[PDB]
Curated annotation (Swiss-Prot), chain B:
Residues 251-457 form the ABC transmembrane type-2 domain. Residues 11-228 form the ABC transporter domain. It catalyses: abscisate(in) + ATP + H2O = abscisate(out) + ADP + phosphate + H(+). SMART domains: AAA. High affinity abscisic acid (ABA) transporter that mediates the export of ABA, with a preference for (+)-ABA, through the plasma membrane, especially in vascular tissues (e.g. phloem companion cells), and is involved in the intercellular ABA signaling pathway. Together with ABCG31, export ABA from the endosperm to deliver it to the embryo via ABCG30 and ABCG40-mediated import to suppress radicle extension and subsequent embryonic growth. It comes from the Eukaryota. This is ABC transporter G family member 25. Disruption phenotype: Hypersensitivity to abscisic acid (ABA). SUPFAM superfamilies: P-loop containing nucleoside triphosphate hydrolases (SSF52540).
Length: 512, 513
């Protein structure tokens, strides 16, 4: 392993190969600022191998941040191979990347829990120590030389912290690496395993040198312990185009494969299937063997279907982008994936996974309500319903990507969907003169018109079977069963919205 | 301030007045079980208090400060402590004496600095962890405890805060003659020196009993000695009448209502809720701007939308209250603060008072822009009907929230129930199948919609004759929407019956758990 020599002036100290430096300071002293500046994230002189900070030096330095951002439903080995496939250079073969991932698994003691779901506070899985080990293994794949972590033992027990310090010191005394860490409140064994200790107070450095020399230095200065105690406690108290296409498509494929489990968890929730089944049963019971002559009942059923399947997916889509932002930023900063690949992977996964439920709903409902028999009408209404669902999910994604607050986005989406629903043409027919323009921007309007045109058409049939060829009543029936827009205009506008909402969501993401 | 002497056999040890005993052990050893059993909450061996069996008279003197801190966010420190004093102090004393006891408790715990400061939580800003723990300790200091058995007081706190808390806890034992017993997760160096008696637990077995200072010499004499400068506790862990009853009930209800006012205000007067209500009102006033009575179908749609909105909102919003306060309810009912009846009625009255402002403003804005029936009697009648419907729906929400104690499952069940109620409201489908006609009578939206239609149109003769129906099938379509299947008084009676019955069922469901 190439040796890395570290120098910083204005705080000052040396970090050399084989030295396990630890930054010690009171909570709030400012250890995090120096720890981040040593890595190079921040933007006196800091010199690495007697040279200025350059991108050639940064490819061999890691940073295991305190925040552990891991995907829950992925096993340890699946996670690490996905990381390896996306982080290692593309010139190498797949088998070599897999072997590197396995070597990383083997050398960190994660063999015991290789086939175990990572999980989180919600889904049961690995413990905190294994989570931290996986976090370290994330950046151990690129073979770093300057490994600067940040609070690795925070939130862990004494035994787990001791074992983690054991592994971290072994990675520096057996591989020639410059492991630099910072510890909140060191224990006895944790402190005795130190090699170099840096004390920080109000940003000013109190002591630099070996940890063992700290006690002798301080007792020589004039300050000595008065009772049996931990020395660290005393210290704290004192203180080409083809290649580009191949890369893009490989990134998209890997991201889709990785996000499949999250997509499955998002859509196939037991508290969503229950609602869908209850809605289907109620729809099939309230309209059991409906008659085509009862126009108003069928129109109400169609409007209810439109309301339900415009409200559900649009509201369900506002949580995805704000919830994965930390992961997106952290892995993009490392060069794992770009915005385009991640966005398209999310779009394709959502499109694939958010269509099964409405299909089952319509399949159950169509043949019990006694709608128009045949194959062409059923296929046409299924296609219209799926297109409407996709457009509504597009609006949901756009509003979730515009502002990054989940509850504010939910409130705005509810207001927008209420405005759309109150202009679908079912509740109000005498729309005010200055208020007639918003029906053209409503997805529910186009979906309802398409469903009505599919089920009844121009309306001549039920017009003549009902009796007409009151006058006001038949005018009301006609204006219910005639279209203010054509059959193709609705489909065109639906497709245009489906594309435009995603385009706007991508632009809004690009700003942040 | 008076001596309590403690002996326990089968683990064995003694804790005497003026002794600051602390239980030390690795995480998972079982210190919590012994600490809880010493207090008396557990129910072989004997735990003898003052050379006697555990009795409620002795149970008064002892006090437990649990690790979990359950505090009301919006209340200030002094407001909280005076409410506690008025609740759990004896009713024979005057109000001024209780307030003075609360003030003295504030003064003696160093909480004077943050007396007029909101307690808050992770969401609302306020006091820090040390002050939260100090308030939690002050909760049980009002009854003048003589055996204070806490549970991990310094967990989750900084070194300086933990040292100061240990300072205060030791001062309360060496200046007032109290038997303070705690347990510390991982003691520091300065903290351990203040220990007076240390008990070491390993797999439930007592490794060492006696003075903390004697631990090092004893363990060196046994054969185990430190090999490097290290903290001693680290080595130890590594080795390891009817009138009076009525007065009491009504006073408890009054105090609870006064205390819960701020939480009720926070629950209802949320800016997002106001924004939703304002947007709904504006949309309703814009879609039906200067509506005409002759357009019956549009007005019926408006009434049904109002019914849907104000049946869906409060019923779903009222489903979170009971599950979120269960820990507080159980903890303060165990101490004897309030009974189930007083707490339930206080919550009911607070919700009734605070859940009527928004619909009143909504209807007041909407009525005079949609151009509904003019006058005063119709407006007052429709306002009363809307308020009654809102209360009934909130009753269903409360009942379902109190039946099963899970917020999201309750929300799903409430949404399913409200969808079933809405689908059978009489607006979407008129040809109801024969086997599903009974479900219309159990719907609150049905009765509310019928009442609104009867208020606005009545028997419907007027618009029938102005519309010209003074085909027959076409008139039947108009007639079937205005002519109701129930009377005007049956709907009101059933609404009142549901308003009472849902709350009764909620109380029964609460009584079970």
């Amino acid at each position: 392993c190439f040796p890395i020599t570290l120098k910083f002036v204005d705080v000052t100290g040396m970090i050399s190969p084989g030295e396990f430096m630890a930054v010690l300071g009171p909570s709030g002293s400012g250890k995090s600022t120096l720890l981040n500046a040593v890595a190079g994230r921040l933007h006196g002189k800091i010199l690495i191998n007697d040279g200025k900070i350059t991108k050639q030096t940064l490819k061999r330095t890691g940073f295991v941040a305190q925040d552990d951002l891991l995907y829950p439903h992925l096993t340890v080995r699946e996670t690490l191979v996905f990381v390896a496939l996306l982080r290692l250079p593309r010139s190498l073969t797949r088998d070599v990347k897999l072997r590197a991932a396995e070597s990383v698994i083997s050398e960190l003691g994660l063999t015991k829990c290789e086939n175990t779901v990572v999980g989180n506070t919600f889904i049961r899985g690995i413990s905190g120590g294994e989570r931290k080990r996986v976090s370290i293994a994330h950046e151990l794949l690129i073979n770093p030389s300057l490994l600067v972590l940040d609070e690795p033992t925070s939130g862990l027990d004494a035994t787990a912290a001791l074992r983690l310090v054991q592994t971290l010191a072994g990675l520096a005394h057996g591989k020639g690496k410059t492991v630099v860490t910072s510890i909140h409140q060191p224990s006895s064994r944790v402190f005795q395993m130190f090699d170099t200790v840096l004390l920080l107070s109000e940003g000013k450095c109190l002591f630099v040198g070996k940890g063992r020399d700290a006690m002798a230095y301080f007792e020589s200065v004039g300050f000595s312990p008065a009772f049996p105690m931990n020395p660290a406690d005393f210290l704290l108290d004192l203180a080409g185009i083809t290649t580009c296409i191949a890369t893009w498509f490989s990134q998209l494929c890997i991201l889709l494969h990785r996000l499949l489990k999250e997509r499955r968890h998002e859509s196939f929730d037991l508290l969503r299937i229950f609602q869908v089944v209850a809605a289907s049963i109620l729809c099939g019971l309230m309209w059991w063997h409906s008659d085509y002559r009862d126009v108003h009942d069928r129109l109400g059923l169609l409007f209810f279907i439109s309301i339900f399947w415009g409200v559900l997916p649009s509201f369900n889509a506002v949580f995805t982008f704000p919830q994965e932002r930390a992961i997106f930023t952290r892995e993009r900063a490392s060069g794992m994936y770009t915005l385009s690949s991640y966005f398209m992977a999310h779009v394709l996964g959502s499109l694939s996974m958010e269509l099964v439920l409405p299909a089952s709903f319509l399949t159950f409902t169509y043949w019990m309500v006694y709608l128009r028999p045949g194959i062409v009408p059923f296929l046409l209404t299924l296609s219209v319903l799926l297109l409407y669902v996709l457009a509504s999910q597009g609006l949901g994604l756009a509003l979730g990507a515009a502002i990054m607050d989940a509850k504010k986005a939910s409130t705005i989406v509810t207001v927008t969907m209420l405005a759309f629903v109150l202009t679908g043409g079912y509740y109000v027919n005498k729309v005010p003169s200055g208020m007639v323009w918003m029906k053209y921007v409503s997805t529910t309007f186009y979906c309802y018109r398409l469903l009505v045109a599919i089920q009844y058409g121009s309306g001549e049939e039920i017009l003549r079977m009902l009796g007409c060829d009151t006058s006001a009543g038949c005018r009301f029936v006609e204006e219910e069963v005639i279209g203010d827009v054509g059959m193709w205009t609705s489909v065109g506008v639906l497709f245009l919205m489906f594309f435009g909402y995603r385009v706007l969501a991508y632009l809004a993401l690009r700003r942040i």
